[PDB]
Design an enzyme around this catalytic site. Structure first.
Site, PDB file in Angstrom:
ATOM      1  N   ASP A  48       2.409   5.275   3.672  1.00 14.98           N
ATOM      2  CA  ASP A  48       3.595   4.645   4.246  1.00 14.98           C
ATOM      3  C   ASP A  48       4.822   4.698   3.329  1.00 14.98           C
ATOM      4  O   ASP A  48       4.945   3.898   2.396  1.00 14.98           O
ATOM      5  CB  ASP A  48       3.277   3.196   4.587  1.00 14.98           C
ATOM      6  CG  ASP A  48       4.390   2.523   5.349  1.00 14.98           C
ATOM      7  OD1 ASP A  48       5.326   3.215   5.783  1.00 14.98           O
ATOM      8  OD2 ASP A  48       4.324   1.292   5.526  1.00 14.98           O
ATOM      9  N   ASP A  84      10.459   7.443   7.102  1.00 14.40           N
ATOM     10  CA  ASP A  84       9.350   6.503   7.228  1.00 14.40           C
ATOM     11  C   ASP A  84       8.044   7.114   7.728  1.00 14.40           C
ATOM     12  O   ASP A  84       7.828   7.297   8.935  1.00 14.40           O
ATOM     13  CB  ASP A  84       9.752   5.320   8.107  1.00 14.40           C
ATOM     14  CG  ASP A  84       8.670   4.272   8.209  1.00 14.40           C
ATOM     15  OD1 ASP A  84       7.614   4.456   7.590  1.00 14.40           O
ATOM     16  OD2 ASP A  84       8.876   3.261   8.912  1.00 14.40           O
TER      17      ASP A  84
END
Ligand SMILES: CC[C@H](C)[C@@]1(NC(C)=O)CCN([C@@H](CCc2ccccc2)C(=O)N[C@@H](Cc2ccccc2)[C@H](O)CNCc2cccc(OC)c2)C1=O
EC number: 3.4.23.46
Length: 387
Positions: free
Chosen positions: A34, A230
């Site tokens: 992430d 992201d």
């Protein structure tokens, strides 16, 4: 870096994970990569969707920090307990690091059934770590304790077709090169954009094209109130206003067929006969990113193969089905895995900048290919960042 090649697994809808070990003796866990968060966190208690979890009582090297952490993600949240432990990456650099670990005791809409990961690796910067920026994020601890360069790079790999759990299990999902750039992972040139500020991986979008046609908005609007790269978001998410005119221009280009409004909301599927998907009828999307040299610019170009996310036909039939992977956002632009799948993305933390090159990994047809191209001069470009 042949050791680290092919070390990723998964898909865009449910995130790509790497195998790590946690504690002494080594406790093996699959960890979601992430770039849009900063907390290293693993499940620590039995859970409906977890087939294994972190057991501190069984780790001799575990240290209790006696502090609670709560991390709210855009959609999903978990409560945990702060502690450190020795952590390694089996198919990564041959090193061991004591790093902060959030032991997740409670969770809501965080864990995903049959996803095969049991934790999250927050690759972003301290500033957005919870509870505050004094919690040193993993990659920081890693870079601070070892000889590994302040650099990592991501090749996220979409299949172009649905994957049943045992296939996501057996397929290669891509690569995470910790401490380098592997040249076999990309074709063409590497174009860098600066990181605007070291909280999220924030970048600046200068201009947007749908099939070469300018969306023609105030560029500020594209980065309202930020634009981040992201890993942990599926979609390309755009600000309300930007999404509106992007969906209007995309609908235009695709007049030939008409689709449910629920499709554009990312809520309803759309299916064609096997092999029948009309990629040509859907537009290309180009994103212009601020360059390194003053007034220079570059663009990344994605195909419908990126922004149309494949899902399995619930029906018994052989139809090829998709969900529209571009959605509305009120917290800015999120360049999700859907985009990242098109490219090899270099996170040159050392030089506070993000690199882009065409993925050897990316799905295309015969007539179009994803692109990273430049430079571009004409660009009125400075006021584009939001304050
Ligand atoms: C890997 C994809 C994942 C499986 C997921 N799949 C789908 C199909 O929605 C589910 C959650 N999710 C999005 C939201 C999508 C969305 C958006 C709006 C409505 C519905 C769905 C998301 O919140 N991802 C987390 C990580 C994460 C991974 C897995 C589970 C939970 C979180 C990011 O770290 C957030 N970055 C900004 C940020 C924001 C705040 C604090 C921050 O600092 C701590 C950072 C996805 O794409």
């Amino acid at each position: 870096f042949v050791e680290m090649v092919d070390n990723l697994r998964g898909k865009s809808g449910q995130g790509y994970y790497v195998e790590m070990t946690v504690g002494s003796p080594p406790q093996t866990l699959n960890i979601l990569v992430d770039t849009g968060s900063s907390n290293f966190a693993v499940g620590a208690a039995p859970h409906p969707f977890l087939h294994r979890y972190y057991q501190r009582q069984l780790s001799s090297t575990y240290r209790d920090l006696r502090k609670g952490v709560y991390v709210p993600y855009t959609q999903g949240k978990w409560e945990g307990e702060l502690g450190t432990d020795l952590v390694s990456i089996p198919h990564g650099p041959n090193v061991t690091v004591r790093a902060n670990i959030a032991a997740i005791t409670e969770s809501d809409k965080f864990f995903i059934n049959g996803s095969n990961w049991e934790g999250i690796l927050g690759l972003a910067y301290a500033e957005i770590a919870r509870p505050d920026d004094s919690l040193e994020p993993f990659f920081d601890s890693l870079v601070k304790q070892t000889h590994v360069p302040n650099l990592f790079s991501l090749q996220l790999c979409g299949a172009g077709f649905p994957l049943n759990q045992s296939e996501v299990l057996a397929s290669v999902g891509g690569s995470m090169i910790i401490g380098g750039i592997d040249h076999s992972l990309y074709t063409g040139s590497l174009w860098y954009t600066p990181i605007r500020r070291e909280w999220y991986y924030e970048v600046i979008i200068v201009r947007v094209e749908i099939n070469g046609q300018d969306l023609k908005m105030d560029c500020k609007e594209y980065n309202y109130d930020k634009s981040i790269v992201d890993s942990g978001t599926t979609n390309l998410r755009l600000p309300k206003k930007v999404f509106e005119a992007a969906v209007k221009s995309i609908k235009a280009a695709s007049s030939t067929e008409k689709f449910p409004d629920g499709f554009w909301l990312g809520e309803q599927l759309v299916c064609w006969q096997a092999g029948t998907t009309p990629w040509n009828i859907f537009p290309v999307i180009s994103l212009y990113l601020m360059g390194e040299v003053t007034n220079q610019s570059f663009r990344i170009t994605i195909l419908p193969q990126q922004y149309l996310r494949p899902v399995e036909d619930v029906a018994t039939s052989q139809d090829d089905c998709y969900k529209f992977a571009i959605s509305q956002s009120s917290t800015g632009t999120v360049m999700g895995a859907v985009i990242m799948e098109g490219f090899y993305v270099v996170f040159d933390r050392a030089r506070k900048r993000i690199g882009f090159a065409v993925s050897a990994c990316h799905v295309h047809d015969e007539f179009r290919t994803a692109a990273v191209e430049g430079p571009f001069v004409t660009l009125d470009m400075e006021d584009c960042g939001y304050n």
